[PDB]
Amino acid sequence: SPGIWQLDCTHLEGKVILVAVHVASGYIEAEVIPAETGQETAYFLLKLAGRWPVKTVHTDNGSNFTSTTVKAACWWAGIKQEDGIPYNPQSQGVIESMNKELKKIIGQVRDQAEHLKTAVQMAVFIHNHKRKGYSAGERIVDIIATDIQ
Amino acid sequence: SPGIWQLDCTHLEGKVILVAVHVASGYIEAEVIPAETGQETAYFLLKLAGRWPVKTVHTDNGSNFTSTTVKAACWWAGIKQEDGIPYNPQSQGVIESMNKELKKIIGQVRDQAEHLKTAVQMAVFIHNHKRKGYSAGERIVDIIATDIQ
Ligand SMILES: COc1ccc(CNC(=O)c2ccccc2C[NH2+]Cc2ccc3c(c2C(=O)O)OCO3)cc1
Ligand SMILES: COc1ccc(CNC(=O)c2ccccc2C[NH2+]Cc2ccc3c(c2C(=O)O)OCO3)cc1
Ligand SMILES: [Cl-]
Ligand SMILES: [Cl-]
Predict the structure, then answer these.
(1) DSSP state of B115
(2) CATH number at residue B90
(3) Ligand 1 geometric centre to CA of A32 (Å)
(4) Separation of A9 CA from ligand 3 center, angstroms?
(5) Fewer beta carbons within 10 Å, N or C terminal of chain A?
(6) Are B114 and A104 spatial neighbours (Cβ–Cβ below 8 Å)?
(7) d(CA B3, CA B49)
(8) Which ligand minimizes its atom distance to the CA of B34?
(9) In what order do the strands lie in the sheet with A4-12?
(10) Burial code of B79-89, b = ≥16 C-beta within 10 A, e = fewer?
(11) Which residues constitute the domain of residue A44?
(12) Do the Cβ atoms of B109 and B119 come closer than 8 Å?
């Protein structure tokens, strides 16, 4: 569980927001891309795995599961590439609610930047710092530290 | 100390590599940009602070210290923007040795990607995972977790 991440792709302003969620904590990283490609997804995962100990990634769709480039990135970075089948139906709703939350935050900050990518990074910040009382950022560090110890 | 980061800018292939180093652990994040601007530096810091609890950033030079855009990003993200004056002379050598190490790793991976940004992210991965026996990635998580607790 400490090493399990889930990919998620959502759309806004004719662009794609690619999100990685640390399942156990709700911590996220995200980027804006023109379109979801294996190339972009592969690069995103390479970045993620250099920053956090990513053991397993549940891909967001079958195209990214199939993509040889995504498979190669997962090979390179020592990531177990898995499907994203919601054998637990609650997964679906959690991701959906997260996308709605993220879009809400983006709306709340949208006039504070010209570019969508800037607003998205503001949303990442706000999401990860929000106390629910610990924040997702606090939870991921505690979970991983406990695992190391 | 758990919240202290240092910016560092180095050059390769006619491009700029912007690095943030977590001082206490040696953990890094990095990106390739065409040139160092306040705009790019500001965006980089916004990304960093959404991902880690960045309390203080020692800027890499006077232009980024002066930049109103960098100041505004630091304001937005709750970062104390400071100078990078090496009152401790050892800081200089550590950063310089890090740049040499990073460039060495980039050379070792360079033929595994077309684009420099990809090689840089591979270097980030290798640097953060390298056991010296804990890795920088393990050290940053332990330092921050201890601070939370
Ligand atoms: C991240 O640093 C920040 C600096 C300042 C502010 C406060 N907001 C404004 O001053 C503002 C508000 C509305 C439109 C334009 C602006 C000025 N431009 C902000 C900006 C900076 C760096 C970037 C950007 C943008 C962008 O506008 O998208 O895009 C990629 O790198 C927020 C964040
Ligand atoms: C990150 O996923 C990886 C997938 C595969 C490999 C193994 N290496 C090769 O197959 C290779 C080797 C040499 C030249 C071109 C290639 C193929 N292209 C790799 C690539 C992928 C995604 C990107 C890229 C690049 C790039 O070439 O820079 O740039 C931004 O997004 C490494 C990383
Ligand atoms: Cl798409
Ligand atoms: Cl420059």
Answers:
(1) S
(2) 3.30.420.10
(3) 15
(4) 8
(5) C
(6) no
(7) 10
(8) 4
(9) A27-33, A15-22, A4-12, A56-58, A80-82
(10) bebeebeeeee
(11) 1-149
(12) yes
Cβ atoms within 10 Å of B112's Cβ, excluding its own = 11
DSSP code for B36 = -
Q: Is A88 exposed, middle or buried (0-12, 13-18, 19+ CB in 10 A)?
A: exposed
* Minimal CA separation from A17 to chain B, in Å: 15
Q: What Rg value do the Cα atoms of chain B yield, rounded?
A: 15
3-class secondary structure, A33: strand
For this experimental structure, what is the resolution in angstroms? 1.8
End-to-end CA distance of chain A: 15
Q: Among candidates A83, A11, A12, A8, which has minimal Cα distance to A48?
A: A8
For tokens 């880690």, the residue is B52
User: Are the C-beta atoms of A124 and B51 separated by less than 8 Å?
Assistant: yes
- DSSP secondary-structure letter at B131? B
User: What distance in Å separates the CA atoms of residue B37 and residue A133, rounded to the nearest whole number?
Assistant: 38
Solved using:
X-ray
User: Using alpha carbons only, how large is chain A's radius of gyration in Å?
Assistant: 15
